[PDB]
Design a protein around this ligand. Structure first.
Ligand code: GET
Ligand code: YMZ
Lengths: 231, 249, 67, 121
RNA sequence: GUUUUUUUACUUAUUCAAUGAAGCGGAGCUGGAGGUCAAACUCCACGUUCUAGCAUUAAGCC
RNA sequence: UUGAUUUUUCAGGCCAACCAUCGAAAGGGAAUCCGGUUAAAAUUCCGGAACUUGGAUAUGGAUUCUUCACGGCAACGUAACU
């Protein structure tokens, strides 16, 4: 016991060498890291026009979970599922029968930007989900206005990768429903009522709301002290 | 005509500085945490001659704050600094000859050398033998200090800029005449190729604007516009006045 | 489809939306090398009109040139 | 969310797996045979009067050798061709551009007997 | 209501500088003050100065 | 760099300030001398006597039960002496 003394190190200026602290704040990151962080910052600093600022307000966790719950019951055919349907149809036509009979009409999610745009323009889409992170943004920046003019309920959802895995792709810009089964019409109606309150009913007043204009943490510190001085 | 000697100097071929025997550049320490917030102690190891320079240099050793390692710095030696002396650099450093302090921490009238124009540039002003910078006044609200330079000019510098207390050593070189072309030869042998100098009026017209004529004479005014072009700027460039200076300035 | 909308939108280079996009993208492009590979066309409709297809063996590069 | 601790400010290229080549065809169909075998290393004996004097006295055999061969290859080559052991090999590039080797045999061998057996004396 | 001039605020464009991108910004502990009169409201500091030594690979506590 | 494991795979740990390369037959730089010998070579051959570097590895010695040697006031000494 008397041989285990306490030898406190002194880390003041001019004293013992500084210990290994966590210096992640001071790291010299590679150039691509710095570029992608400053891209996000610069989009926050400037004034964002309302057309782009629309995409900043996405469905909350709960409503998005409900949307993807409904929307997962209508996923497209995988390669294997289509393969089996095709062999079944081949059997039917090697008999006297045809393909239309043995396979029911499909009721699936609709994806693909050109396809979904043309579905909206024909008033065939009942619900459109738009990814918030599409780049270049002009691919979907007009979509809320189009859906408004066509009276098609829409929601800016989070995740082109989520929409992608819904339809067995890496990413998907949009996802749409043209129809659902009789058992699901109630939940689709409730979903549409919930999202219409934030998106299609607010579209005209969001047309007037600019985004961005947000300063950094140190600049917000300077403003706060100026606000307390006059206080 | 021909490219004049003025113009040839900028290509830097035979006119680059002769630097083999030089002893490293003389700079202050980098502004680090210790100098911003407290002070750091170093010890003078050597006072050495730097060829091409009139002022001696001081080799001063410091501990590295962040790793087990010794850091050597090359300072311009002020008069009275000796080998073995402890040197203190930082915001909290005492007002002693050889110490490095922010200009805001020095009272009015303090003599200081190797002063920074901008904070952290490691020294720009008052570096030659016998010269120094005087602190004239402080403007704490603006965090500015007013100083007097060797040329007589007055300047405003940030109070966070540093200087070294005292007068640069080696002062008084110019009080003794060189006496000889050979002494001038040995002087520039370790500086650059600027000596001897042929007079422009002793050349031919190809060589210089002053060349030629059946007597040696300039032939037009030697005062040249600031807006003149290269090949024309020989003589007294943009002179406000000429002739013997009489009276105060 | 969407390509017609993109065509007509890219003709409004002085609208606030396009001015914002051009500012941000010009800064980004100016941060990268004078010549760099682009992972995809920034104007897919324009690229389609000029012969691009989203196939293997089609490549997009970006370059800045002094004015 | 769970962020790395970095005790250095220098970011370095991370370590990634380096695979060995597994080509789907070999690049050279037939490997080359030995380019300096013993018969190409030793070109011919040198039997000038000066050379044979070195044979008679210093137990040294004198040969013309390939310009590209070194002392190790020459030692091995005489071992494989004549079953002798060299004490050393001294080499020389002649003014006509060919290489000459002065090979002194160990005391276990008689250079004159080996030279008679090789056939040039 | 849109427009010219002047002035001055901002920071992300752009520009200058330093570094092996090491301690920035804000808050808070600890103290010392300002006589308090409501309880912490303002301020300031926050481990190194007789000496040409030594400080590196954490002790200790839960 | 080790601990080794053979499994030609691992397990860690230590750091990466600096370091492409070229640039001297007078600068820097591991180590050879004497005698003899040829028509013509020699600090290169022959005879004798050494040295340096890189490696392997055995014996002898030295060290350790006060574990990593003793002596001298000291300057310092020694065949060794983590
Ligand atoms: C004249 N004195 C100035 C003083 O006025 C002030 O300067 C600010 C400067 O800090 C601001 O700017 C600074 O701070 C902002 C932000 C953190 O507030 C940063 O975004 C910016 O990069 C930085 N340069 C600049 N936008 C206005 C100057 N008057 O601070 C610096 C100073 C030298 O003391
Ligand atoms: O401003 C003056 C002053 C002069 C000088 C001197 F000229 F000697 F270098 N040095 C001063 C210093 C000094 F640099 F630290 F020595 C500090 C403060 C004032 C000084 C006077 C001197 C008497 C005491 C009051 N300050």
């Amino acid at each position: 016991n008397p041989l285990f003394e306490s030898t406190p190190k002194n880390f003041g200026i001019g004293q013992s060498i500084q210990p290994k602290r966590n210096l992640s704040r001071f790291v010299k990151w590679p150039e691509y890291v710095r570029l992608q962080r400053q891209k996000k910052i610069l989009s926050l600093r400037l004034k964002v026009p309302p057309s782009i600022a629309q995409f900043s307000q996405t469905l909350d966790k709960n409503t998005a979970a409900q949307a993807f719950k409904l929307l997962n019951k209508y996923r497209p055919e995988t390669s294997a599922e289509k393969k089996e349907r095709l062999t079944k149809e081949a059997a039917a036509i090697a008999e006297g029968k045809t393909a239309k009979d043995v396979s029911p009409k499909p009721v699936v999610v609709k994806y693909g930007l050109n396809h979904v745009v043309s579905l909206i323009e024909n008033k065939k889409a009942k619900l459109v989900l738009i990814a918030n992170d599409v780049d270049p943004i002009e691919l979907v920046v007009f979509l809320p206005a189009l859906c408004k003019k066509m009276g098609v309920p829409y929601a800016i959802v989070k995740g082109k990768a989520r929409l992608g895995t819904l339809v067995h792709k890496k990413t998907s810009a949009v996802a749409a429903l043209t129809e659902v089964n009789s058992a699901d019409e109630a939940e689709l109606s409730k979903l549409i009522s919930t999202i219409n309150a934030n998106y299609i009913e607010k579209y005209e007043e969001n047309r007037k709301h600019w985004g961005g204009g947000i300063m950094g943490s140190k600049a917000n510190d300077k403003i706060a002290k100026k606000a307390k001085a006059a206080a | 005509g021909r490219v004049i000697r003025n113009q040839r100097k900028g290509a830097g071929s035979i006119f680059t500085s002769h630097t083999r025997l030089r002893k490293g550049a003389a700079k202050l320490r980098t502004l680090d945490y210790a100098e911003r917030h407290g002070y750091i102690r170093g010890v003078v190891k050597q006072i050495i001659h730097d060829p091409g320079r009139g002022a001696p240099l001081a080799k001063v050793a410091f501990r590295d704050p962040y790793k087990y390692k010794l850091r050597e710095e090359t300072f311009i030696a002020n008069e009275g600094v000796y080998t073995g002396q402890f040197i203190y650099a930082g915001k909290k450093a005492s007002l002693n000859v050889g110490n490095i302090l922010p200009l805001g921490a020095c009272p009015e009238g303090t003599i200081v050398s190797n002063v920074e124009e901008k904070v952290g540039d490691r020294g720009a002003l008052g570096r030659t033998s016998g010269n120094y910078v005087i602190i004239i006044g402080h403007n704490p609200d603006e965090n500015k200090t007013r100083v007097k330079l060797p040329s007589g000019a007055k300047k405003i510098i940030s109070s966070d800029a540093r200087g070294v207390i005292g007068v640069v050593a080696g002062g008084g070189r110019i009080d003794k005449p060189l006496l000889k072309a050979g002494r001038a030869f040995h002087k520039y042998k370790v500086k650059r190729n600027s000596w001897p100098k042929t007079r422009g009026v002793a050349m031919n017209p190809v060589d210089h604007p002053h060349g030629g004529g059946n007597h040696q004479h300039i032939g037009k005014a030697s005062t040249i516009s600031r807006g003149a072009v290269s090949g024309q700027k020989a003589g007294l460039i943009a002179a406000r006045r000429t002739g013997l200076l009489r009276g105060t300035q | 489809g969407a390509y017609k909308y993109l065509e007509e939108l890219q003709r409004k280079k002085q609208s606030d939306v396009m001015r914002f996009l051009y500012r941000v993208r010009c800064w980004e492009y100016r941060q990268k090398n004078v010549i760099h590979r682009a992972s995809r066309p920034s104007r897919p409709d324009k690229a389609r009109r000029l012969g691009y297809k989203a196939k293997q063996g089609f490549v997009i590069y970006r370059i800045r040139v002094r004015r | 969310k769970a962020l790395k601790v970095r005790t250095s400010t220098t970011f370095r290229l991370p370590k990634t797996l380096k695979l060995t080549r597994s080509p789907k065809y070999q690049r050279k169909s037939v490997p080359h045979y030995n380019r300096l075998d013993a018969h190409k290393i030793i070109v011919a004996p040198i039997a000038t009067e000066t050379a044979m004097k070195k044979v008679e006295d210093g137990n040294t055999l004198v040969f013309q050798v390939d310009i590209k061969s070194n002392k190790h290859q020459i030692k091995s080559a005489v071992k494989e061709l004549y079953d002798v052991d060299a004490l050393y090999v001294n080499t020389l590039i002649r003014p006509n551009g060919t290489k000459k080797a002065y090979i002194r045999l160990t005391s276990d061998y008689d250079a004159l007997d080996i030279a008679n057996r090789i056939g040039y004396i």
